[PDB]
């Protein structure tokens, strides 16, 4: 009775997730990551478009799926 | 009243936490003999003494086809009927005979919790354990020697739980 | 992983249930479905949607 | 033959099954039936017909 | 061991053994957190 064969294998080693992860959330005291980070009267054109581009995309730190990027330092916005 | 035949104290249960709340003398089952003579009054006192004897003592002494879970289920290991498996050629249509594997299915169905609990008490065990307690000579000691379990507003570790915070 | 994760036998992915019975009124109406989950299956209600 | 051919118990010869589910789409019509074959019986599907 | 590490304490600062890595566009990812 071992279920390791069902899991994805990360190379001679099953990819067993942390057992400490079973959901629990309520009104106060429960906070989850990935927060809400974010005819022109004004013709600047430029920053405007750029800003719209920014508005449609993303950035944060626990986004560590895969890799952070080369040489390093550990930072915030936890 | 009398420090020798006392009206018993009856516990109060808190269902929610499982602990036992404060208790109190029984106040719903008293007998009103205030209109009786010495004969019946002695008889009633003897009856209450008999009740107290019953309580003290009680408390002190008395502390194939497995059933599955109420509907038995049969059990077969080599009941495999559809021996085919779809290789490159075959194409198996709808199928399936639900059978409980003897070791895997049943044992996985009847495993207990991973680690046993440590906390409050359920109703049945509370009934079996917390009989009414007879307090013979009430509060006869120095301060701090009294049974604090009786006061519902008393916490075992931090003494005398201040209500209203 | 290869074995014991996906059913090789013919099986649907997106089942479609039809209303067995329906009632109407001037302000609200009622729809009743006979949701069926055959053996060797598990249904996560989060996917269900009218 | 005399015996072991035909039941003496009250058994139907023809059974009709009412649809349980219906759908009248603009280009189709889906019907569902609960075919029930009781014990001590055998049904030759060639007899069945919508 | 290694003495070539930043030391934030008397104890060295060393990451996880399992740190070497991969991703193919594929979706051979679409995988979870560092946590």
Swiss-Prot record, chain A:
Residues 1-30 form a propeptide. Coiled coil: none annotated. Ubiquitinated by Nedd4 following partial capsid disassembly; which might play a role in intracellular virus movement during entry. Residues 39-56 are annotated as: Interaction with hexon protein. A motif (Nuclear export signal) lies at residues 49-58. The record marks 30-31 as: Cleavage. Induction: Expressed in the late phase of the viral replicative cycle. It comes from the Viruses. N-terminal amphipathic alpha-helix domain is essential for the membrane lytic activity. Belongs to the adenoviridae protein VI family. All late proteins expressed from the major late promoter are produced by alternative splicing and alternative polyadenylation of the same gene giving rise to non-overlapping ORFs. A leader sequence is present in the N-terminus of all these mRNAs and is recognized by the viral shutoff protein to provide expression although conventional translation via ribosome scanning from the cap has been shut off in the host cell. This is Pre-protein VI. It comes from Human adenovirus C serotype 5 (HAdV-5). The gene is L3. The chain holds residues 4 to 96 of 250 of the full protein.
UniProtKB/Swiss-Prot annotation, chain B:
One of its GO terms (cellular component) is viral capsid. One of its GO terms (molecular function) is hexon binding. Cleaved by the viral protease during virion maturation. May cause the middle segment to be shed from the capsid. The modification Phosphoserine is found at residue 112. InterPro entries: Adeno_PVIII. The record marks 95-96 as: Cleavage. Keywords: Capsid protein, Host nucleus, Late protein, Phosphoprotein, Virion. Transmembrane segments: none annotated. Residues 64-95 form a propeptide. Pfam families: Adeno_PVIII (PF01310). Induction: Expressed in the late phase of the viral replicative cycle. All late proteins expressed from the major late promoter are produced by alternative splicing and alternative polyadenylation of the same gene giving rise to non-overlapping ORFs. A leader sequence is present in the N-terminus of all these mRNAs and is recognized by the viral shutoff protein to provide expression although conventional translation via ribosome scanning from the cap has been shut off in the host cell. Interacts with the peripentonal hexons as well as the hexons in the facets. Part of a complex composed of the core-capsid bridging protein, the endosome lysis protein VI and the hexon-linking protein VIII; these interactions bridge the virus core to the capsid. Belongs to the adenoviridae hexon-linking protein family. This is Pre-hexon-linking protein VIII. It comes from Human adenovirus C serotype 5 (HAdV-5). The gene is L4.
Swiss-Prot record, chains C, D:
Induction: Expressed in the late phase of the viral replicative cycle. It is found in: Virion; Host nucleus. Disulfide bonds: none annotated. Belongs to the adenoviridae hexon protein family. Major capsid protein that self-associates to form 240 hexon trimers, each in the shape of a hexagon, building most of the pseudo T=25 capsid. Assembled into trimeric units with the help of the chaperone shutoff protein. Transported by pre-protein VI to the nucleus where it associates with other structural proteins to form an empty capsid. Might be involved, through its interaction with host dyneins, in the intracellular microtubule-dependent transport of incoming viral capsid to the nucleus. All late proteins expressed from the major late promoter are produced by alternative splicing and alternative polyadenylation of the same gene giving rise to non-overlapping ORFs. A leader sequence is present in the N-terminus of all these mRNAs and is recognized by the viral shutoff protein to provide expression although conventional translation via ribosome scanning from the cap has been shut off in the host cell. Homotrimer. Interacts with the capsid vertex protein; this interaction binds the peripentonal hexons to the neighboring penton base. Interacts with the hexon-linking protein; this interaction tethers the hexons surrounding the penton to those situated in the central plate of the facet. Interacts with the hexon-interlacing protein; this interaction lashes the hexons together. Interacts with host dyneins DYNC1LI1 and DYNC1I2; this interaction might be involved in intracellular microtubule-dependent transport of incoming viral capsid. This is Hexon protein. The chain holds residues 52 to 101 of 952 of the full protein.
